[PDB]
Design an enzyme around this catalytic site. Structure first.
Site, PDB file in Angstrom:
ATOM      1  CG  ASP A 124     -69.122 -64.464  42.737  1.00  0.00           C
ATOM      2  OD1 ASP A 124     -68.399 -64.153  43.072  1.00  0.00           O
ATOM      3  OD2 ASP A 124     -69.783 -66.103  42.721  1.00  0.00           O
TER       4      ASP A 124
HETATM    5  O1  LIG Z   1     -71.358 -63.865  36.183  1.00  0.00           O
HETATM    6  S1  LIG Z   1     -72.242 -63.836  36.581  1.00  0.00           S
HETATM    7  O2  LIG Z   1     -72.850 -64.900  36.262  1.00  0.00           O
HETATM    8  N1  LIG Z   1     -71.511 -64.503  38.255  1.00  0.00           N
HETATM    9  C1  LIG Z   1     -70.247 -63.916  38.589  1.00  0.00           C
HETATM   10  C2  LIG Z   1     -69.276 -64.816  39.313  1.00  0.00           C
HETATM   11  C3  LIG Z   1     -68.163 -63.600  39.594  1.00  0.00           C
HETATM   12  C4  LIG Z   1     -67.423 -63.131  38.629  1.00  0.00           C
HETATM   13  C5  LIG Z   1     -67.254 -64.630  37.697  1.00  0.00           C
HETATM   14  N2  LIG Z   1     -68.014 -65.884  38.515  1.00  0.00           N
HETATM   15  C6  LIG Z   1     -73.785 -63.553  37.241  1.00  0.00           C
HETATM   16  F1  LIG Z   1     -74.746 -63.473  36.849  1.00  0.00           F
HETATM   17  F2  LIG Z   1     -74.714 -63.151  37.983  1.00  0.00           F
HETATM   18  F3  LIG Z   1     -73.608 -62.156  36.974  1.00  0.00           F
END
Ligand SMILES: O=S(=O)(NC[C@@H]1CCCN1)C(F)(F)F
Ligand SMILES: O=S(=O)(NC[C@@H]1CCCN1)C(F)(F)F
Lengths: 442, 442
Positions: A124
């Site tokens: 992500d």
């Molecule tokens: O911070 S998280 O929970 N997820 C990241 C996502 C993309 C930006 C905000 N949410 C991680 F653990 F995957 F980094």
């Protein structure tokens, strides 16, 4: 059969392991960290190279020219430097993190050179783009349009390791995630833009996520969900919402840190080392003395007697006599302490949860409510769920460029079926499975 | 190097796989199921033998005499038959399920023959005995006594597969677990025996289990926890409690089935096949007709408008026109339908959670509060957590008898360090890890 992996540790391990399965490929590794690349060199057969990307830009141009593909695993501010090298020579690139506005300016130069640069690869961003565009293309195949797109994602501990005040363990530095609580969140809902206030009031936007009854989850919106209309081509959609998942109690614990004045970039406060009790005495505005006295000052500052937030600070040692780490600010000092107290031990599993929800209007007139679940756990004697979900999409996209499967050229994400189709298929073999379900509503 | 595995399917698979790693061992398999042993024969190299244990007792005596060890994976009522064969010949035995009173009578005959029979092996009973006696022996090593023993265990789906009315998926027939709601629960608490009423009132004994904040668990006591004083030798303990873990909402859904009159062994109710709508019309006492009419009758019977329990019955198809399976009773018919609707698909993980808590009084005077966490998940292209936790302890104990590590003779459980020490050590390699933590209270 030769590639340069800029950056090392954590994300690199699954990238090196996946690429080195066949054998016919020479792995080169560039890195700033001297101790990390030596430890990484012990596990996987590589060519160690020590270099700063900004300072030693001359040797980068000569080293990049020798390779077939540059796999950048660096912070996303440094991609214009690696892209500047890659566009000059005849060589492709792949990027884990976001395609920044600065990197988007090079698109003219990238297409003229006749090369392929794939960004936005990983969990992500990455798998969110791939799962979204798979469903969106499937809807467009039958003439259907997207009315709503809600997508929550979260990296967090496996439920068995959730018994701490944050219900969390940090893989890397929490300076970003802590500062995101101070930032705003914009999103589209029923044809109305909704701006959410960050900081002290951000806790009000936190909601209960009940899609898994057995899993005790909370959710909150990301920094900006309106941009996905242009990216996916779904500007007709009345709802666009993207959020982050945590276990219940997480945002309330961080809300405690906001009340106390710990989430800011102000510098630290004569001939004796600064302890956590002394720092909190400074913030609440009392003399550095007496532990039971600062308890009364802290609980008074943390709302009208919020004992849960007091206990959270007590448990982490914020009222104790442990030394504050050397740092540029209070937030950076907190982040170093949280990494110390809440990290993954060698035999402790992490978890990646990801939940999408589409409202798809078919030409018939009916509404399809499609949902996607993606859940993965870390392997005990293997890679973590975070490492696999971040590493493998970048590593697989790299292998596809070397094999010559991706025919398209220029700057791009993983939005085309050419890219997302083979990756989603291949991550199933690596233990990253996603299920699908849909119901029709007349 | 020869063993007879009586019974097949599910529990046998990890037992056959573990024993057949070295190669120097001839696996024989006896079974009543004709189709199951053929399917099991395809995966693992065995000698298929079809036999009923009760009817064909003559060939059992000759077949058992040819082996070095009999691994009984049958229902626990049939152990006196296999024990009767094993005591006559010079051959050892291992048992997965409980050592019944009937099998306990043979202890005189078993010791005279000069053989070893190990019962109570697997998850529960089994690993509960091993983890308990490990901690109890560690307390006795430093002169400490056990004041309290609380131990909750549960086999259930991984959180991602918990979105159904029961929050559950059945591995085998639920006739036992459904009938246990009707049974009582006795346990010791602070020097007072507490008898809990089964049936309609059993929901009142259900409690929230919050040891993992991320996991949304409920708990309730087992049928009889007072027997562990004599078994472990902890009669001085003021608290003995043993219970079962489920996700929240499970017992409330079963409480719905109790209200409707589905949990009983009465027979089923002319020239047309009996559907679920027609059966529920019989129970609520109306004519078999109109689906919206029985909805009003059912919701009235399920307390003062319990829509959750109505929806649970609606979701499972208990008000629909699907046929009731052929069965000896209504409970057996329900059990067959629940197996049909709520089972594990090929790529769906299960979970084993187990949580112990000891109050240990040291000679000093202080109280040690020791806790043990054991959490395991099923492998995608491998064994389920249930299969591993039930199968491997029996399989490992079998290998220890063949290798000649267990020197003790007679009828016994896995209570001695000779048995539990090597097993707990070896299950770590198989992916069954347990952690420990303790705090002192002056
Ligand atoms: O911070 S998280 O929970 N997820 C990241 C996502 C993309 C930006 C905000 N949410 C991680 F653990 F995957 F980094
Ligand atoms: O039914 S469980 O949850 N646990 C069984 C234990 C032993 C008897 C009651 N509780 C199972 F799934 F493991 F079988």
């Amino acid at each position: 059969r030769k590639v340069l992996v800029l950056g090392s540790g954590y994300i690199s391990e699954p990238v090196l392991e996946y690429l080195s399965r066949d054998g016919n490929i020479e792995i080169t590794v560039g890195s700033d960290m001297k101790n990390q690349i030596e430890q990484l060199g012990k596990k996987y057969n590589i060519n160690p190279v020590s270099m700063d990307i900004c300072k030693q830009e001359e040797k980068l141009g000569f080293l990049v020219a020798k390779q077939d593909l540059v796999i950048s695993l660096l912070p996303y501010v440094l991609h214009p430097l690696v892209a500047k090298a890659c566009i000059t020579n005849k060589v492709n690139m792949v990027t884990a993190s976001y395609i920044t506005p600065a990197l988007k300016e090079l698109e003219k130069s990238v297409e003229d050179a006749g090369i392929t640069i794939i960004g936005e690869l990983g969990l992500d961003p990455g798998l969110d783009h791939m799962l979204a565009m798979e469903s969106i293309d499937k809807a467009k195949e039958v003439g259907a349009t997207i009315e709503s797109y809600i997508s929550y994602c979260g990296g967090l501990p496996a439920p068995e390791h959730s018994n701490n005040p944050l219900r969390y363990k940090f893989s890397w530095s929490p300076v970003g995630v802590l500062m995101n609580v101070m930032q705003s969140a914009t999103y589209l809902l029923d044809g109305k833009v909704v701006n959410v206030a960050g900081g002290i009031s951000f806790l009000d936007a936190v909601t209960s996520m009940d899609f898994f009854p057995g899993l005790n989850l909370e959710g909150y919106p990301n920094r900006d969900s309106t941009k996905y209309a242009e990216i996916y081509g779904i500007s007709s959609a009345h709802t666009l919402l993207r959020g982050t998942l945590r276990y219940k109690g997480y945002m309330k614990a961080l809300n405690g840190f906001v009340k106390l004045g710990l989430i800011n970039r102000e510098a630290l406060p004569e001939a004796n080392p600064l302890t956590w009790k002394q720092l909190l005495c400074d913030l609440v505005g009392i003399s550095p003395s007496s532990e039971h006295d600062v308890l009364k000052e802290a609980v008074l500052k943390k709302l009208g007697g919020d004992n849960t937030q007091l206990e959270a600070a007590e448990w982490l040692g914020l009222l104790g006599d442990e030394q504050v780490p050397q740092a540029e600010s209070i937030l950076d000092a907190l982040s170093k302490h949280l990494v110390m107290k809440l990290s993954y031990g060698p035999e402790e599993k992490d978890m990646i949860v990801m939940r999408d929800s589409f409202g798809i209007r078919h030409p018939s007139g009916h509404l399809e409510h499609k949902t996607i679940d993606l859940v993965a756990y870390g392997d005990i004697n293997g890679f973590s769920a975070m490492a696999k979900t971040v590493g493998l999409p970048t590593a697989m996209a790299a292998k596809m460029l070397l094999d010559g499967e991706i025919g398209a050229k220029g700057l791009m994400g993983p939005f085309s079926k050419e890219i997302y189709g083979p990756i989603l298929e291949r991550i199933k073999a690596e233990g990253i499975i996603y299920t699908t379900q849909s119901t029709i509503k007349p």
